[PDB]
Short mmCIF file of C-alpha atoms (C1' of nucleotides) in Angstrom, two decimals:
data_model
loop_
_atom_site.label_atom_id
_atom_site.label_comp_id
_atom_site.label_asym_id
_atom_site.label_seq_id
_atom_site.Cartn_x
_atom_site.Cartn_y
_atom_site.Cartn_z
CA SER A 1 78.95 111.86 140.98
CA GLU A 2 80.53 108.49 141.76
CA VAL A 3 81.99 107.40 138.40
CA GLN A 4 85.41 106.02 139.32
CA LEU A 5 87.97 103.58 137.91
CA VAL A 6 90.74 102.08 140.06
CA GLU A 7 93.53 100.06 138.43
CA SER A 8 95.88 97.62 140.14
CA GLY A 9 98.14 94.68 139.59
CA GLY A 10 100.84 96.83 138.08
CA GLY A 11 104.41 96.65 139.25
CA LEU A 12 107.89 95.36 138.59
CA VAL A 13 108.00 92.23 136.45
CA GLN A 14 110.86 90.23 134.98
CA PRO A 15 111.12 90.17 131.16
CA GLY A 16 109.02 87.33 129.82
CA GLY A 17 106.76 87.25 132.86
CA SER A 18 103.07 87.73 133.38
CA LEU A 19 100.76 90.19 135.12
CA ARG A 20 97.03 90.71 135.37
CA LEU A 21 95.96 94.33 135.62
CA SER A 22 92.52 94.93 137.13
CA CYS A 23 90.11 97.84 137.05
CA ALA A 24 87.34 98.34 139.61
CA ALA A 25 84.39 100.46 138.45
CA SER A 26 82.50 102.49 141.01
CA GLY A 27 79.83 104.95 140.02
CA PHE A 28 78.29 102.99 137.12
CA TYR A 29 77.95 99.41 135.93
CA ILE A 30 80.40 98.34 133.25
CA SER A 31 77.91 96.07 131.50
CA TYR A 32 76.50 99.05 129.58
CA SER A 33 79.73 100.66 128.44
CA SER A 34 82.74 99.82 126.39
CA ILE A 35 85.96 99.43 128.45
CA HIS A 36 89.43 100.20 127.04
CA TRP A 37 93.05 99.95 128.26
CA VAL A 38 95.38 102.76 127.21
CA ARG A 39 99.09 102.72 128.13
CA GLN A 40 101.85 105.36 128.24
CA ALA A 41 105.56 104.61 128.42
CA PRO A 42 107.42 107.18 130.54
CA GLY A 43 107.60 110.54 128.81
CA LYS A 44 106.05 108.99 125.72
CA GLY A 45 102.48 109.32 124.40
CA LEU A 46 99.16 107.54 124.79
CA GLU A 47 98.86 104.11 123.14
CA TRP A 48 95.62 102.17 122.81
CA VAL A 49 95.94 98.52 123.93
CA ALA A 50 92.63 96.64 123.94
CA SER A 51 88.94 97.01 124.61
CA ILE A 52 85.91 94.80 125.08
CA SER A 53 82.53 95.74 123.70
CA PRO A 54 79.31 95.73 125.78
CA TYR A 55 76.62 93.10 125.10
CA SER A 56 78.91 90.95 122.92
CA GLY A 57 82.25 90.52 124.68
CA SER A 58 83.99 91.21 121.41
CA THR A 59 87.67 91.94 121.97
CA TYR A 60 89.99 94.16 119.90
CA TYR A 61 93.75 94.49 120.34
CA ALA A 62 96.50 96.81 119.38
CA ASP A 63 98.75 94.93 117.01
CA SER A 64 101.77 95.29 119.31
CA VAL A 65 100.11 93.16 121.98
CA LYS A 66 98.12 90.78 119.75
CA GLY A 67 98.32 87.29 121.21
CA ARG A 68 100.28 88.35 124.29
CA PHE A 69 97.48 90.24 126.02
CA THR A 70 93.88 89.36 126.77
CA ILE A 71 91.12 91.75 127.85
CA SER A 72 88.02 90.46 129.59
CA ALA A 73 85.34 91.60 131.98
CA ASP A 74 83.61 90.10 134.99
CA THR A 75 80.11 91.54 135.28
CA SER A 76 79.56 90.23 138.81
CA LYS A 77 82.71 91.91 140.04
CA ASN A 78 82.04 95.06 137.94
CA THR A 79 85.70 94.64 137.01
CA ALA A 80 87.77 94.50 133.82
CA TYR A 81 91.06 92.60 133.51
CA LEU A 82 94.12 92.51 131.27
CA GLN A 83 96.27 89.42 131.37
CA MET A 84 99.65 90.33 129.91
CA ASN A 85 101.94 87.42 129.08
CA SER A 86 105.44 87.21 127.71
CA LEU A 87 106.16 90.79 128.68
CA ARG A 88 109.07 92.73 127.21
CA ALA A 89 110.97 95.83 128.21
CA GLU A 90 108.91 98.07 125.96
CA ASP A 91 105.63 97.17 127.68
CA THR A 92 106.96 99.37 130.50
CA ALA A 93 104.24 101.94 131.01
CA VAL A 94 101.41 103.32 133.09
CA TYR A 95 98.35 101.25 132.06
CA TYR A 96 95.14 103.29 132.18
CA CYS A 97 91.56 101.94 132.27
CA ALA A 98 88.85 103.93 130.45
CA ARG A 99 85.09 104.06 130.15
CA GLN A 100 83.81 104.80 126.65
CA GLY A 101 81.01 107.26 127.28
CA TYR A 102 77.33 106.79 126.65
CA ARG A 103 76.84 107.52 122.94
CA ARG A 104 73.93 109.95 123.43
CA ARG A 105 76.17 111.98 125.77
CA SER A 106 79.81 111.81 124.60
CA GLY A 107 80.06 110.07 121.21
CA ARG A 108 82.90 107.52 121.21
CA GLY A 109 84.98 109.59 123.62
CA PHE A 110 86.53 108.12 126.75
CA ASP A 111 84.79 110.15 129.47
CA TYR A 112 86.31 108.63 132.66
CA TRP A 113 89.86 107.39 133.27
CA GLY A 114 91.60 105.62 136.11
CA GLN A 115 94.78 106.97 137.68
CA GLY A 116 96.80 104.30 135.91
CA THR A 117 98.83 101.45 137.28
CA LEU A 118 102.56 101.44 136.57
CA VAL A 119 104.09 98.32 135.02
CA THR A 120 107.92 98.23 135.05
CA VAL A 121 109.43 95.42 132.96
CA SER A 122 113.10 94.90 133.85
CA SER A 123 115.06 92.18 135.50
CA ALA A 124 117.23 94.35 137.75
CA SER A 125 116.19 93.89 141.37
CA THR A 126 114.42 96.37 143.66
CA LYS A 127 116.31 98.58 146.13
CA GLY A 128 115.18 101.27 148.58
CA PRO A 129 116.42 104.85 148.76
CA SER A 130 118.91 106.17 151.17
CA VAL A 131 117.42 109.59 152.11
CA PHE A 132 119.90 112.25 153.02
CA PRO A 133 119.12 115.78 154.25
CA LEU A 134 119.71 119.06 152.38
CA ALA A 135 120.53 121.35 155.28
CA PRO A 136 119.78 125.05 154.67
CA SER A 137 122.52 127.64 154.70
CA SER A 138 123.59 129.25 157.97
CA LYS A 139 122.67 132.69 156.49
CA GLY A 140 115.02 136.69 154.06
CA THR A 141 114.39 133.15 152.85
CA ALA A 142 116.60 130.08 152.39
CA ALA A 143 115.80 126.60 151.15
CA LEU A 144 116.08 123.08 152.60
CA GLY A 145 115.10 119.65 151.41
CA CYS A 146 115.73 115.95 151.08
CA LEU A 147 118.00 114.06 148.67
CA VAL A 148 116.36 110.71 147.82
CA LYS A 149 119.21 108.63 146.36
CA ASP A 150 119.68 105.31 144.51
CA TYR A 151 116.30 103.59 144.59
CA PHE A 152 114.47 101.34 142.16
CA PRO A 153 111.83 101.07 140.74
CA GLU A 154 109.82 104.21 140.45
CA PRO A 155 107.92 105.73 142.18
CA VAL A 156 108.86 107.34 145.50
CA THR A 157 106.71 109.92 147.24
CA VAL A 158 108.02 112.83 149.30
CA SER A 159 105.85 114.82 151.65
CA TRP A 160 106.97 117.31 154.29
CA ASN A 161 105.81 117.33 157.90
CA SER A 162 103.36 114.49 157.18
CA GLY A 163 101.89 116.50 154.32
CA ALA A 164 101.17 119.56 156.47
CA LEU A 165 103.82 121.67 154.67
CA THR A 166 102.64 121.74 151.06
CA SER A 167 103.49 125.32 150.03
CA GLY A 168 106.69 126.15 148.18
CA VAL A 169 107.69 122.50 147.69
CA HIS A 170 109.47 121.30 144.53
CA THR A 171 109.94 117.53 144.31
CA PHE A 172 112.00 117.11 141.13
CA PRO A 173 111.43 114.22 138.72
CA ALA A 174 113.73 111.27 139.21
CA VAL A 175 116.67 111.08 136.89
CA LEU A 176 118.28 107.77 136.06
CA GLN A 177 121.67 107.18 137.65
CA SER A 178 124.13 105.47 135.32
CA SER A 179 124.08 103.02 138.24
CA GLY A 180 120.70 102.02 136.82
CA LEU A 181 118.94 103.36 139.92
CA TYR A 182 116.76 106.40 140.52
CA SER A 183 117.78 109.51 142.40
CA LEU A 184 115.73 112.66 142.92
CA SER A 185 115.62 115.45 145.43
CA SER A 186 112.78 117.39 147.02
CA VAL A 187 113.22 120.91 148.35
CA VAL A 188 111.14 123.61 149.97
CA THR A 189 111.83 127.26 150.80
CA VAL A 190 110.96 128.75 154.17
CA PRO A 191 111.54 132.21 155.70
CA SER A 192 114.78 132.18 157.71
CA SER A 193 113.32 132.79 161.21
CA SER A 194 111.47 129.43 161.52
CA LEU A 195 114.83 127.58 161.45
CA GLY A 196 115.39 127.37 165.21
CA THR A 197 111.84 126.48 166.20
CA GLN A 198 110.20 124.69 163.23
CA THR A 199 110.78 120.95 162.88
CA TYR A 200 111.27 120.08 159.17
CA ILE A 201 110.76 116.40 158.40
CA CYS A 202 110.36 115.02 154.91
CA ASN A 203 108.49 111.71 154.61
CA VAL A 204 109.88 109.45 151.90
CA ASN A 205 107.84 106.41 150.90
CA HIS A 206 109.03 103.84 148.37
CA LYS A 207 106.27 101.26 148.14
CA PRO A 208 108.11 98.75 145.82
CA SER A 209 110.69 98.04 148.54
CA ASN A 210 108.22 98.55 151.42
CA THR A 211 110.52 101.40 152.48
CA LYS A 212 109.21 104.37 154.43
CA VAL A 213 111.85 106.80 155.66
CA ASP A 214 111.24 109.96 157.63
CA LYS A 215 114.20 112.31 157.75
CA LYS A 216 114.24 115.34 160.00
CA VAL A 217 115.99 118.25 158.27
CA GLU A 218 117.65 120.50 160.84
CA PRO A 219 120.14 123.35 160.16
CA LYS A 220 123.95 123.33 160.12
CA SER A 221 124.96 121.68 163.39
CA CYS A 222 127.67 124.26 164.13
CA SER B 1 95.76 98.66 107.44
CA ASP B 2 95.99 101.12 110.35
CA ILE B 3 94.70 104.66 110.34
CA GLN B 4 97.52 106.99 111.26
CA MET B 5 96.85 110.08 113.32
CA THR B 6 99.64 112.52 112.54
CA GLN B 7 99.36 115.52 114.85
CA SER B 8 101.43 118.73 114.70
CA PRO B 9 103.23 120.68 116.11
CA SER B 10 105.01 118.41 118.56
CA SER B 11 105.20 121.41 120.95
CA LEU B 12 103.81 124.95 121.30
CA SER B 13 104.92 127.99 123.32
CA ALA B 14 102.33 130.70 123.58
CA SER B 15 101.54 133.84 125.51
CA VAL B 16 98.58 133.98 127.86
CA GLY B 17 95.51 134.86 125.83
CA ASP B 18 96.93 133.91 122.41
CA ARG B 19 95.09 131.69 119.97
CA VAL B 20 96.49 128.16 119.60
CA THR B 21 95.61 125.64 116.88
CA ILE B 22 96.55 121.97 116.97
CA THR B 23 95.82 119.87 113.92
CA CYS B 24 95.60 116.14 113.38
CA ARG B 25 95.48 114.56 109.93
CA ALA B 26 93.95 111.11 109.73
CA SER B 27 95.69 109.01 107.12
CA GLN B 28 92.23 107.75 106.12
CA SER B 29 88.69 108.96 106.43
CA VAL B 30 87.68 108.57 110.05
CA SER B 31 84.30 110.27 109.59
CA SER B 32 83.83 112.53 112.64
CA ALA B 33 85.05 109.87 115.07
CA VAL B 34 87.79 112.08 116.57
CA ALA B 35 88.13 113.06 120.24
CA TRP B 36 90.47 115.60 121.84
CA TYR B 37 92.10 115.10 125.24
CA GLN B 38 93.88 117.33 127.73
CA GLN B 39 96.50 115.59 129.93
CA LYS B 40 98.43 117.37 132.56
CA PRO B 41 101.62 115.88 134.05
CA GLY B 42 100.90 113.07 136.47
CA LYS B 43 97.16 113.05 135.67
CA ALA B 44 94.92 110.93 133.53
CA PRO B 45 93.69 112.48 130.28
CA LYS B 46 90.42 114.37 130.33
CA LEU B 47 87.94 114.48 127.42
CA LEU B 48 87.32 117.81 125.63
CA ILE B 49 85.73 117.20 122.19
CA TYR B 50 84.27 114.02 121.00
CA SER B 51 82.43 114.17 117.68
CA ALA B 52 85.23 116.35 116.25
CA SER B 53 83.10 119.39 117.20
CA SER B 54 81.07 118.49 120.28
CA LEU B 55 82.29 120.15 123.48
CA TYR B 56 82.04 117.50 126.20
CA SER B 57 80.12 118.20 129.39
CA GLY B 58 81.94 120.77 131.53
CA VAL B 59 84.80 121.64 129.19
CA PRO B 60 85.06 125.48 128.98
CA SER B 61 83.70 127.24 125.90
CA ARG B 62 87.21 128.38 124.87
CA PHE B 63 87.76 124.85 123.44
CA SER B 64 86.22 123.63 120.20
CA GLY B 65 86.84 120.96 117.61
CA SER B 66 86.44 121.42 113.86
CA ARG B 67 86.68 118.91 111.07
CA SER B 68 87.73 119.52 107.47
CA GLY B 69 87.71 116.19 105.65
CA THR B 70 90.61 114.23 107.12
CA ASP B 71 91.88 117.29 109.07
CA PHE B 72 90.88 117.89 112.72
CA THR B 73 91.72 121.06 114.68
CA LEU B 74 91.41 121.80 118.40
CA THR B 75 91.17 125.57 118.96
CA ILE B 76 91.76 127.61 122.12
CA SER B 77 90.47 131.14 121.46
CA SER B 78 92.51 132.59 124.37
CA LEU B 79 94.94 130.66 126.61
CA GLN B 80 94.52 130.54 130.40
CA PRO B 81 97.57 129.50 132.44
CA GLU B 82 95.86 126.27 133.56
CA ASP B 83 95.78 125.21 129.90
CA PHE B 84 99.31 123.85 130.35
CA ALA B 85 99.00 120.19 129.23
CA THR B 86 99.82 117.69 126.46
CA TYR B 87 96.92 117.39 123.98
CA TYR B 88 96.17 114.14 122.14
CA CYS B 89 93.85 113.57 119.17
CA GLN B 90 92.29 110.09 119.01
CA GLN B 91 90.43 108.27 116.20
CA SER B 92 87.81 105.71 117.25
CA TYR B 93 86.39 105.17 113.76
CA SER B 94 88.20 101.85 113.19
CA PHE B 95 89.89 99.17 115.28
CA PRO B 96 92.69 99.37 116.44
CA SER B 97 92.16 102.80 117.92
CA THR B 98 94.85 105.46 117.38
CA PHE B 99 96.18 108.51 119.24
CA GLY B 100 98.09 111.55 118.11
CA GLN B 101 101.70 111.70 119.15
CA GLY B 102 100.74 114.70 121.29
CA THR B 103 101.39 118.44 121.45
CA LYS B 104 102.99 120.13 124.48
CA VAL B 105 101.83 123.63 125.39
CA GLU B 106 103.82 126.08 127.50
CA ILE B 107 102.75 129.20 129.33
CA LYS B 108 104.70 132.37 128.62
CA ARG B 109 105.42 135.01 131.25
CA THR B 110 107.80 137.82 131.99
CA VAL B 111 111.36 136.77 132.72
CA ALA B 112 112.14 135.61 136.25
CA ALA B 113 115.70 135.22 137.36
CA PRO B 114 116.44 132.02 139.32
CA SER B 115 116.91 132.13 143.06
CA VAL B 116 120.12 130.11 143.50
CA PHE B 117 121.33 127.88 146.33
CA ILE B 118 124.14 125.38 146.80
CA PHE B 119 124.02 122.38 149.15
CA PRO B 120 127.17 120.58 150.40
CA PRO B 121 126.78 116.85 150.99
CA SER B 122 125.26 115.66 154.24
CA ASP B 123 127.31 113.98 156.92
CA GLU B 124 125.42 110.67 156.71
CA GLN B 125 126.30 110.47 153.01
CA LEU B 126 130.03 111.19 153.46
CA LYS B 127 130.19 108.33 155.97
CA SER B 128 128.71 106.04 153.33
CA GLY B 129 131.53 107.09 151.00
CA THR B 130 129.40 109.06 148.54
CA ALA B 131 129.41 112.82 148.03
CA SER B 132 126.70 114.67 146.11
CA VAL B 133 126.77 118.44 145.64
CA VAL B 134 123.35 119.91 144.85
CA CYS B 135 122.67 123.29 143.25
CA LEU B 136 119.12 124.60 143.05
CA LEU B 137 117.76 127.26 140.64
CA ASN B 138 114.35 128.21 141.94
CA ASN B 139 111.19 129.63 140.34
CA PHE B 140 112.53 131.04 137.09
CA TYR B 141 111.45 131.55 133.47
CA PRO B 142 112.15 130.97 130.54
CA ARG B 143 113.53 127.47 131.17
CA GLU B 144 116.66 128.36 129.17
CA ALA B 145 119.54 128.12 131.64
CA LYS B 146 123.17 127.02 131.82
CA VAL B 147 124.68 125.58 134.98
CA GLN B 148 128.42 124.95 135.30
CA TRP B 149 130.18 123.30 138.22
CA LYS B 150 133.66 124.57 138.99
CA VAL B 151 135.67 122.74 141.63
CA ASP B 152 138.72 124.83 142.68
CA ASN B 153 137.99 126.91 139.57
CA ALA B 154 137.94 123.87 137.32
CA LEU B 155 134.89 123.46 135.08
CA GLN B 156 133.50 119.92 135.37
CA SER B 157 132.16 117.81 132.55
CA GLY B 158 129.96 114.74 132.61
CA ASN B 159 129.49 114.11 136.33
CA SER B 160 126.52 116.45 136.83
CA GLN B 161 122.85 115.59 136.31
CA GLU B 162 119.99 118.03 136.31
CA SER B 163 116.24 117.78 136.23
CA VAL B 164 113.56 120.40 135.74
CA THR B 165 110.12 120.80 137.19
CA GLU B 166 107.13 121.25 134.94
CA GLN B 167 105.64 124.73 134.65
CA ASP B 168 103.94 125.62 137.92
CA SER B 169 100.70 126.59 136.21
CA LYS B 170 99.92 129.31 138.77
CA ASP B 171 103.55 130.51 138.72
CA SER B 172 104.27 129.73 135.03
CA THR B 173 107.89 129.14 136.06
CA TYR B 174 110.51 126.39 136.38
CA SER B 175 112.89 125.00 139.00
CA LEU B 176 116.13 123.17 138.28
CA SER B 177 118.35 120.94 140.39
CA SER B 178 121.87 120.23 139.09
CA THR B 179 123.74 117.50 141.01
CA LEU B 180 127.47 116.97 140.71
CA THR B 181 128.44 113.60 142.18
CA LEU B 182 131.89 112.44 143.33
CA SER B 183 133.33 109.64 145.34
CA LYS B 184 134.26 110.59 148.89
CA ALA B 185 137.89 110.52 147.76
CA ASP B 186 137.47 112.95 144.86
CA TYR B 187 135.45 115.24 147.14
CA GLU B 188 138.20 115.37 149.77
CA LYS B 189 140.82 116.55 147.24
CA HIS B 190 139.37 120.02 146.80
CA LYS B 191 138.24 122.97 148.84
CA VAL B 192 135.96 125.19 146.76
CA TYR B 193 132.76 123.86 145.22
CA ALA B 194 130.83 126.33 143.05
CA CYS B 195 127.71 126.42 140.85
CA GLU B 196 127.69 128.85 137.91
CA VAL B 197 124.24 129.84 136.65
CA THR B 198 123.76 131.76 133.40
CA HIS B 199 120.20 132.91 132.80
CA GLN B 200 118.41 135.54 130.74
CA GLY B 201 117.13 137.22 133.92
CA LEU B 202 120.67 137.56 135.27
CA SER B 203 122.91 140.29 133.87
CA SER B 204 125.91 138.42 135.33
CA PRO B 205 126.48 134.71 135.94
CA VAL B 206 125.56 134.07 139.60
CA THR B 207 127.88 131.75 141.54
CA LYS B 208 126.94 130.22 144.86
CA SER B 209 129.83 128.35 146.44
CA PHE B 210 131.10 126.82 149.66
CA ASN B 211 134.43 125.61 151.01
CA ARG B 212 134.88 122.13 152.42
CA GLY B 213 134.54 122.11 156.20
CA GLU B 214 133.32 125.65 156.90
CA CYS B 215 130.74 125.18 159.62
"C1'" G C 1 35.06 60.44 63.90
"C1'" G C 2 34.32 66.15 63.58
"C1'" U C 3 32.78 70.57 66.29
"C1'" U C 4 32.80 72.10 70.56
"C1'" G C 5 30.86 73.41 75.52
"C1'" C C 6 30.70 71.09 80.43
"C1'" U C 7 33.50 68.67 84.79
"C1'" C C 8 38.11 65.64 86.87
"C1'" G C 9 43.29 66.47 85.32
"C1'" A C 10 49.48 64.42 84.51
"C1'" C C 11 52.21 68.35 84.24
"C1'" U C 12 54.26 73.03 83.51
"C1'" G C 13 54.25 78.04 84.06
"C1'" U C 14 54.37 82.43 86.67
"C1'" G C 15 58.11 85.24 81.43
"C1'" A C 16 62.16 92.18 83.10
"C1'" G C 17 62.39 98.05 78.28
"C1'" C C 18 60.87 95.89 71.96
"C1'" G C 19 58.51 94.46 79.14
"C1'" G C 20 58.01 90.23 85.24
"C1'" A C 21 54.85 93.18 90.35
"C1'" C C 22 49.68 86.52 93.16
"C1'" C C 23 49.61 84.96 98.69
"C1'" U C 24 51.37 82.96 103.28
"C1'" A C 25 54.95 80.61 106.93
"C1'" C C 26 59.91 79.79 108.16
"C1'" C C 27 64.92 80.40 106.95
"C1'" C C 28 68.71 83.07 104.78
"C1'" A C 29 70.25 87.63 103.62
"C1'" C C 30 70.99 93.87 102.50
"C1'" U C 31 70.39 99.33 104.35
"C1'" G C 32 69.29 102.83 107.78
"C1'" U C 33 67.78 104.41 112.82
"C1'" G C 34 66.95 103.16 117.78
"C1'" G C 35 67.63 100.02 122.02
"C1'" A C 36 73.13 102.65 128.20
"C1'" A C 37 74.87 99.13 121.82
"C1'" A C 38 81.55 100.85 116.58
"C1'" C C 39 81.11 93.95 115.69
"C1'" A C 40 77.43 90.33 117.83
"C1'" C C 41 71.91 90.31 119.59
"C1'" C C 42 66.81 92.89 119.30
"C1'" A C 43 63.17 96.15 117.56
"C1'" C C 44 61.63 99.16 113.78
"C1'" A C 45 61.71 101.92 108.98
"C1'" G C 46 63.25 100.83 104.00
"C1'" G C 47 65.25 97.92 98.80
"C1'" A C 48 68.10 103.79 92.76
"C1'" A C 49 64.90 106.18 89.48
"C1'" C C 50 61.43 106.32 85.54
"C1'" U C 51 58.53 102.83 84.15
"C1'" U C 52 55.55 98.26 83.50
"C1'" C C 53 51.51 95.14 86.26
"C1'" C C 54 46.66 94.06 88.97
"C1'" A C 55 47.83 87.61 89.86
"C1'" A C 56 44.43 91.39 94.89
"C1'" C C 57 40.20 94.75 96.65
"C1'" C C 58 36.35 98.60 95.55
"C1'" U C 59 33.71 100.75 91.38
"C1'" U C 60 28.45 105.30 89.89
"C1'" C C 61 32.77 101.18 85.01
"C1'" G C 62 34.91 107.39 84.75
"C1'" G C 63 38.28 105.60 88.28
"C1'" G C 64 39.99 104.54 92.97
"C1'" U C 65 42.62 101.54 96.92
"C1'" G C 66 46.62 98.83 98.38
"C1'" G C 67 51.03 96.65 97.08
"C1'" C C 68 58.79 95.13 95.20
"C1'" G C 69 64.68 91.66 99.22
"C1'" A C 70 64.44 89.43 90.89
"C1'" G C 71 67.31 85.20 98.07
"C1'" G C 72 66.13 79.73 99.98
"C1'" U C 73 62.37 76.11 101.27
"C1'" A C 74 57.39 75.09 101.10
"C1'" G C 75 51.80 75.29 101.22
"C1'" G C 76 48.48 77.45 98.27
"C1'" G C 77 46.48 81.80 94.15
"C1'" C C 78 46.23 82.64 89.08
"C1'" A C 79 47.43 80.87 83.85
"C1'" G C 80 47.81 77.02 80.20
"C1'" A C 81 47.06 72.21 79.78
"C1'" A C 82 49.20 66.06 78.10
"C1'" G C 83 44.87 62.74 79.63
"C1'" A C 84 39.88 61.18 81.80
"C1'" G C 85 34.88 62.01 81.64
"C1'" U C 86 30.80 64.23 79.31
"C1'" G C 87 27.03 66.77 76.63
"C1'" A C 88 24.77 69.79 72.77
"C1'" C C 89 25.78 69.95 67.34
"C1'" C C 90 27.41 67.64 62.28
#
RNA sequence: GGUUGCUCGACUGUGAGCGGACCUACCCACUGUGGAAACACCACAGGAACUUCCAACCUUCGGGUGGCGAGGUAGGGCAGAAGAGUGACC
């Protein structure tokens, strides 16, 4: 089918500031369905936020956002919005858009979800990652990777060889440096023989800072 | 007042092909307005049951809801390894809506010892005055592991950070990446850097190590 | 003058277990289902039960038919009638 939901407007925002998440619908018209925002703080659970009911425009809010958020829909644009004002640290979350299914088909379930936009409420300023290479050992398989260090905010993305090398890759979840920044490292294992002849480049993208790094990972120089 | 959805257990380890039961207990009557969702890491939730018993379109028959008054149970007759996810019960009987706090499910496999590596800090990094030592523990299970950094046979404390991958649903295993970090100065005071792994699959604590400057 | 029939009729009534079902229009409501539909909007079905009733219709006068939101407004139906005529009778 074509039923799709695409959020945007999420990002890094200073405490107290404003943002206006959007949600494009694709394979259906939103005038006939209920539309809901659900959010998820990192590693926490789902949390319902707001919704607007078809045919009436009636709006309902989670109590934790009541009077700071406002949900609304533009029929012409087949789009649903969420103005968030007076944001605080704890609004930090992926904000998902959801279609409430057609009653005859899926009750009051939410049968299609967006990929979620990430909203990151802090005041500390953005910074891109220095990407350093994890050279494999000089000694039938050994492992090589990239160390993506001291960036902010989430997320980065690591691919290898422009996404051609997908097998065997582990890109570990960022952990929070006491420095306040994010570090993580990606690795991949390869059979030893390819070392001399196989170029190994990881591609590190950090959209918040507009930083793309490509780092070639070659063996021990000596 | 708000309807509370109080879902247990918080977490569930189970063998492939076991039966698993998750239960959610609505603090008020929510009729049959309860839906069950599967969410895998990094993905949006997917609908499974919606009228507390109605299997959504395309969800496999091994899932089923069942209501008993204010008690809702999602039931997997026999786990598949893909069924690794966090499951949330939702009530849409009243406004505001409400979700369960979620239940995390783990695959269970035979033991796999970790493949172990140790990485000494790049040259570009040591010019910038920082020095990270990385130790990898690849493709193992169960996630229970102990890593210990010894520098010059001195156990370190508080300067290492680790992170773990989720369960590779095909593999059913874990990877870990412990990272000792030191200023360039502290790194240049020692020769031997070593990573001491203790795992159930290893009959003896594996140490990978390197000396500073060996080419 | 009485007795009453006859016709106009101010007005009031439409009475709830030991006993209230007249009609129509609008409004205001309640419950369910359905409308791509948790509230709002619309459509449609329906006002606990046993009773009681025929203001309504049909009747072989045996009986049958159809009918309930004790809501608001209002135009009428049906019941008395204060009063006005007006006859027969004493």
